[PDB]
Design a protein around this ligand. Sequence first.
Ligand SMILES: [Ca+2]
Ligand SMILES: [Ca+2]
Ligand SMILES: [Ca+2]
Ligand SMILES: [Ca+2]
Ligand SMILES: [Ca+2]
Ligand SMILES: [Ca+2]
Ligand SMILES: [Ca+2]
Ligand SMILES: [Ca+2]
Ligand SMILES: [Ca+2]
Ligand SMILES: [Ca+2]
Ligand SMILES: [Ca+2]
Ligand SMILES: [Ca+2]
Ligand SMILES: [Ca+2]
Ligand SMILES: [Ca+2]
Ligand SMILES: [Ca+2]
Ligand SMILES: [Ca+2]
Ligand SMILES: [Ca+2]
Ligand SMILES: [Ca+2]
Ligand SMILES: [Ca+2]
Ligand SMILES: [Ca+2]
Lengths: 192, 192, 186, 191, 187, 189, 193, 193, 185, 192
Amino acid sequence: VLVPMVVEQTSRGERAYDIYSRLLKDRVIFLVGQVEDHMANLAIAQMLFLESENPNKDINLYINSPGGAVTSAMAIYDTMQFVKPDVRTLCIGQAASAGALLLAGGAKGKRHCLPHSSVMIHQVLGGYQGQGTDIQIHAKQTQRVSDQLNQILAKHTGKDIERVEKDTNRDYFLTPEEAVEYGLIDSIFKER
Amino acid sequence: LVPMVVEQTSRGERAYDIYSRLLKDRVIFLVGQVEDHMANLAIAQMLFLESENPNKDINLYINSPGGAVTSAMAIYDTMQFVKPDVRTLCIGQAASAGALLLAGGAKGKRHCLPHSSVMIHQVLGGYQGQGTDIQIHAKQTQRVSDQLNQILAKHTGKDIERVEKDTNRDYFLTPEEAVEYGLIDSIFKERP
Amino acid sequence: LVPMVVEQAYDIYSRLLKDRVIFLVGQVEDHMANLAIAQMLFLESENPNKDINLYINSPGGAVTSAMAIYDTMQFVKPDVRTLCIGQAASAGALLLAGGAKGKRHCLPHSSVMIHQVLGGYQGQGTDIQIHAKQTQRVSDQLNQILAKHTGKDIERVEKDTNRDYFLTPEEAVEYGLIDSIFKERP
Amino acid sequence: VPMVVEQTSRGERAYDIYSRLLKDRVIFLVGQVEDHMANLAIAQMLFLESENPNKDINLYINSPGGAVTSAMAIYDTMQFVKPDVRTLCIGQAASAGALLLAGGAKGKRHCLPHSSVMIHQVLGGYQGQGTDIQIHAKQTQRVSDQLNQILAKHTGKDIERVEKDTNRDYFLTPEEAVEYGLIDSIFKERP
Amino acid sequence: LVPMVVEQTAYDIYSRLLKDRVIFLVGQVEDHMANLAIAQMLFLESENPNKDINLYINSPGGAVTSAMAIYDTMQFVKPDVRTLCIGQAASAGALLLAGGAKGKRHCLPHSSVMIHQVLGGYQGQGTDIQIHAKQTQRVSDQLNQILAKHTGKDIERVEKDTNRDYFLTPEEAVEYGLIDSIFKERP
Amino acid sequence: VLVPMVVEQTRAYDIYSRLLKDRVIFLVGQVEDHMANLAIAQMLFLESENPNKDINLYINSPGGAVTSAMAIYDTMQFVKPDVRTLCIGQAASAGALLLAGGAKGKRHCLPHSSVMIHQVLGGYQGQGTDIQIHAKQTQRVSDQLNQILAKHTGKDIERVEKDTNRDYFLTPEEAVEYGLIDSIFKERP
Amino acid sequence: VLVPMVVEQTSRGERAYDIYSRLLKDRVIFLVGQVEDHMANLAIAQMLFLESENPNKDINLYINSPGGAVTSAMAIYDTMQFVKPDVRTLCIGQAASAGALLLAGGAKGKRHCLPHSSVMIHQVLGGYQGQGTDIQIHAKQTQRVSDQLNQILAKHTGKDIERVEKDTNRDYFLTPEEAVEYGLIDSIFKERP
Amino acid sequence: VLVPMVVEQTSRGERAYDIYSRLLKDRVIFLVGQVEDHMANLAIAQMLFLESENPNKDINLYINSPGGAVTSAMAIYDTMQFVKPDVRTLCIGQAASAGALLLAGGAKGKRHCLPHSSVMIHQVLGGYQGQGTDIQIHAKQTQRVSDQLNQILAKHTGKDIERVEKDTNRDYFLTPEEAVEYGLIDSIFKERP
Amino acid sequence: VLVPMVVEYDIYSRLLKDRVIFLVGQVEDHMANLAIAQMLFLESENPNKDINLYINSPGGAVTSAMAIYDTMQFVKPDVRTLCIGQAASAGALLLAGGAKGKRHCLPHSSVMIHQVLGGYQGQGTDIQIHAKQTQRVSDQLNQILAKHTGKDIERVEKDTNRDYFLTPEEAVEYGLIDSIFKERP
Amino acid sequence: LVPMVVEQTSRGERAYDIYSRLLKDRVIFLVGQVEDHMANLAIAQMLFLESENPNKDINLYINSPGGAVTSAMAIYDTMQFVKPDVRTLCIGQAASAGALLLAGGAKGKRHCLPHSSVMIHQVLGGYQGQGTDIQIHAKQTQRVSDQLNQILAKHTGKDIERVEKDTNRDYFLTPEEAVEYGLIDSIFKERP
Ligand SMILES: [Ca+2]
Ligand SMILES: [Ca+2]
Ligand SMILES: [Ca+2]
Ligand SMILES: [Ca+2]
Ligand SMILES: [Ca+2]
Ligand SMILES: [Ca+2]
Ligand SMILES: [Ca+2]
Ligand SMILES: [Ca+2]
Ligand SMILES: [Ca+2]
Ligand SMILES: [Ca+2]
Ligand SMILES: [Ca+2]
Ligand SMILES: [Ca+2]
Ligand SMILES: [Ca+2]
Ligand SMILES: [Ca+2]
Ligand SMILES: [Ca+2]
Ligand SMILES: [Ca+2]
Ligand SMILES: [Ca+2]
Ligand SMILES: [Ca+2]
Ligand SMILES: [Ca+2]
Ligand SMILES: [Ca+2]
């Protein structure tokens, strides 16, 4: 018996050997689309699996995400600090605020992007409906999440939390060079 | 299916919807969910009655099982603005927004019937967006909340803290309990 | 100069309102409840001494709504005579029963039916309890009112309305919900 | 829905067509018999009785369907008001409408030559607990019995015979309907 | 005093034409409009039992069972009902056009008249299917009888022609007997 | 006595129409084109009836587009009568512009009124060239709003710009202090 | 995304696992998304399977659940105590009320979270619609489930039931440090030990 | 939500299994979710299969059902009594009336639940719409099914039919302890020391 | 040993190996044809051993049942029918059409027979054409039931006029089944 | 609906979807609308082919009638990033996003077929929100617009200003025109 090859899985997630799974064999994880719990947990599971196979080889996180929730990315971020392997981050195309958090939370020296990548950070978004008392409770928790995002970004970039809080107030786009300069990445894999 | 009434005017025969006819007796119906559209109609009715006679009482009949306090706010203010005393009678239901209006009637002129149901609770609200905006809207919600407590305290004779505690959750009052609470002044079994 | 119509602005119901007849038909719900109450107050305003005639044909709707109509009935000065033309389901039967002593009637193929209050809530446990308590109070109120107007014991009413309880016109006279049946108008 | 205008001492007064026909003590019972239109019809009879409790009321019927429970209220109203209620079936009298047609005053029930009369047993339904199902089932049996008693009363047939016929959709030509006792005669042209 | 409009949405255009004893039968013939047309004839008869009523028909479809009522109403009211097809008379409308008073059934030069058998349908138990199928056969028979009567054709001839959609030019319709004459311009 | 009386439309003489006789206009609900043109029409009619008597504009609006408010604002400066503004309940940003743009000394609110101001909102979708064209037009509308509030409140344009960057709620007292309104009425004067 | 596969090539041949089944091999179970009956049962099955394989090795329950019903979690909680293996619990990201219950219900000393995890507890939600009599019946049952939740939290945290009943009256967020202090977990892991 | 799988070392080689199919190998069947015809037939098929493998070893039915129709439960119940193996029943979480019927119908002495399980029984529900004659036909059938449920519960709990009928008139929740006392189950698998 | 195992072979495929076929859900064309194809496959594997049809069907059309029934009489193997839970009209036909002496239900099984349903919409001429066909099918149902139960066609027609529920015992008495199993015999 | 192929591996028979089989010949299909999901699938395929053999050419077969330029951007960077020369062939349509990848193939290795349609145009975008945020997204859209011009200029040899002018509106090119313009190098009728 040999496992069947597909480029893409059929609508049923047939247990066929898809292209992403073949890249997983080289320790490459793809983080794409909206960052939300479903895909997030699948990414966390791939890191745990990669760490189980070899806790000493780098894991490569390839990021192309135009959007999504920072609270979802949060679990992925913690997963990356938790597992033993260094996690290399490369932004292939887009890194929006959830995605940029992970890009930035890569191992020191091992965060990159490509020449036309688009990185962008902004403050957490939330929402609540209900009694005032509960609105106050959820509002405080959102303030907490917002502070955590600033602290995480401050830590990996080298910036002040006050500076990061200021920059993330509205959508803040960074060219690749600006992103190196900001400290969100270490270098651009320039055209060779 | 609103019924009409034809009156014989000095100038001739005139049709009235039932509510226009009762308006001729300075009765205003405040019914259904308290929301902006009906709030404004009730307010316009009060200003009309004030224009017809600045001195005769206005009678505001209340039967409202729900709705927003912010909507009730404009009506409450209109009540204090207009010159005529506003007598308030709860025919059936007066949930939070309704209870605000009922209680804000003219001293000694707030009433309900024997099976009326009165219920007060804290304000509800909600917002969705950036954390900064969530904070801004939470603060305004806190203020509207305090306003509701101040208004009930003022009209019932209770302390603000007492009112805050009682509205923390849905708080039902029998007619008797509502008199004792100071939300109304007396109950009418049959017309006085 | 006002237009004349059977239905729509001077409709058939407004014409009957001139004869102090009010129709209470369809599902008993807040909108039609308040309109009914308004006509009673209007009729009281015209003449607080002549009877008001409440014609009932309602196959359902919420007792909490009927509650306001009931209270209005006892509030206004005029005697309210009640006739069930076709159907009086539970909210409608409350109003049927709550008419003036001696002045509650039905037609021979009328259907009267009583049952306990319906309710519902969704949310936190604490709030469920708060709302369950209020439903029990509304439920006791329904029993008390039916008891008062029929002469039955509260417990007996409570037991009978536990489930849908249909009453023929004759059973309804016997029960105390109405005072008499009309074959043809006296 | 057309409007008719009439001259008064005090100006022009406008009427929809049915309000104008009401002026001739004609009431139209058409479409599905359900509560809304049933009550409107009862309201018209009460009004006409109020205007003159002694002149006939004319009920014109064209109803291809609807619920017997709704027809019940109209039927009782008809026996309740003092005026004779003459019934004419212009086109269709399906079960609920057939009830009303038959329940007109003796000697004053009619149809036109291509009218279609049809009678059937009551329909219903309930969803819930077994105990509740039995309660509603009994009430349904009762309403069904009432329908049979009403037809039996106005036709001269026995209830066992009415019950048998209404078991399934039972169509009658106008002649068969005279012979059945549902109507008294057919009008070829206005007599 | 009373307000004037062309269209409802209140004296309107149709109401004004009603004052000259003109009734419009337009759109799909179904119960609602059928009953309105019937009421209008009853009203016109009431105003004057002796003057003709004018039924202007422009109907591209609808159920014969609804038309049946109108037809019986036409023969029931005292006044002669003159019929004119301004545009279309599909089978239900054609039955009405054809059932106008002798000598008083007309159409315009580009009118389209079309007759066909009754349509129907039922769903349920076999016994009920059988029951409704017989009734449909009865109604289908009544349509043929009515058309034969007014056109002068044998019932069998009508039954054959109507077995499928049968279009008739104005001329063909005079010749067939559905109408008596064509008007180019108002005579 | 021909004309029938109703409290609510849906024609008849409704309660709003009766207040129009006393030169009172209600500006309620969302501020958008349809109601804006109705409000502008009422103003033209009132001016036509008497060019010199005040027009009273009662405002209770929780939101809406500034661009639609713009038209109402221009109408208010265009007609000859002084327009008195009173905020009965809510005056969100489109409403607040109208509230603040009433005649000098004749702008008011009630004690639990909520006034709130914020920068314009907008949006476009299409080719880059067109996005730039519409973005420039949004900037202009945004400037016009800062200019109008500056004019009527006495604040600097740069101060108004900063304050409206995000939703900015004012109590009636803060609103008097800001210059959006001239006074508060507890009860009618 | 779609669910990645792991193919282990072997001299024997080759075998294919989805990523979750591959981690099952290492006695790791994921409890993610809304806690509801469907995934609850899959999680219970997985615990029974692991017990079957070896009743003495720890089972690892990784939790990332931002919500869901406490009645659905109850079945998982009972399964955790029922199976022989100790169940270690780690909150990777979110544990709302139902998830918080399973987190706290892990074997003594083997309950953890990561530095930015969010733990949150609240009283049970419920709802019924129908006759008064039935509303009373379901309200009582809700009161019982609500007490049950309080008792379980009291049991595993060391807190008084009345204390827990007061804390869960409204949504109660805990930072990892507060969750340790409260007794819902035993320690926080910055990096895998 | 996605069913994990396992790979086992079989006689002709290694084969995959979904988790439920692997627990099938230990004679465990999961009855979860709403009881309705589709899952009912799967469960019966699983029982017939297990009987076919070994007619003499116990079958284990793990139940977590919050609702569903007694008429669907009927087929499962009868299949339980039909197949040769004793059918042990265990309520892991919830057993609403259709589930409770299957719980109670397990082999003598082999019916259980866990400490926070919820067992609930009520009379049958139904409904019909149509001609009166037909309504009468369907209400009698409903009465028969209603009597069958009472007779089945009575047999297995030892109660009187009249007592069962009275108790199920409305939703009747039992704690695990009451369920033991009632006769629905035989014992609770309490948390080991 | 290569092929994966699931409960949802799949479980029904594994039971197919023991010559068991499930007829469950609404009887309609899709599932009817799968049932038929399974009978043909079983016949092809072994034309002599019984086929076992387990029936649990609360509804469906008689015209789809018709095909299954003919298949049953067509294939060489005896078809044993067991009603595990429900067998409404369409299913009852199949239950009653099992091989003589090999038709069974369980103690709480619900069997129910009724006349054919149908309907048509169109021109009068076509309504008549389809009504007659409906009458033919209605007669075919009665003749099949009379053949297998032993009852007169007139008797079957009267009984099936409206929904006619039979207890297991009544169904043995009626001729629809041969015996009731308490436990596997 | 995707066909399978069974091959005789040295390790036994293996099933391939048609695309995975063509992957064995270093052929990748880029088809349909360009959007993130398919873009990431194509990038993974390039990463996988590089991993198999970093020196052999990758063959990118393009048939895309539309899609977002921002999505294409990730693919274009991937193409410059991986070590193998990427030969591009337009089988049918290359709309603006597709055209960007066609033109971005390796020097001398960009082609189309005789009835191919190539069309370029400026980026589309859009945003909804506060004015400040509108200006922010507008600047970013301008930047992406300039990037697209600079990439097309680089690969065609045209001046940026000329490209900017030409792409102002939909600009269709015949194969011959596309050779002349520098978007491709040659046209094949029959394979050479
Ligand atoms: Ca966010
Ligand atoms: Ca790490
Ligand atoms: Ca006042
Ligand atoms: Ca509120
Ligand atoms: Ca009274
Ligand atoms: Ca009926
Ligand atoms: Ca009479
Ligand atoms: Ca005539
Ligand atoms: Ca037809
Ligand atoms: Ca001729
Ligand atoms: Ca705006
Ligand atoms: Ca001015
Ligand atoms: Ca354990
Ligand atoms: Ca809960
Ligand atoms: Ca057994
Ligand atoms: Ca049930
Ligand atoms: Ca059938
Ligand atoms: Ca055979
Ligand atoms: Ca390259
Ligand atoms: Ca684009």
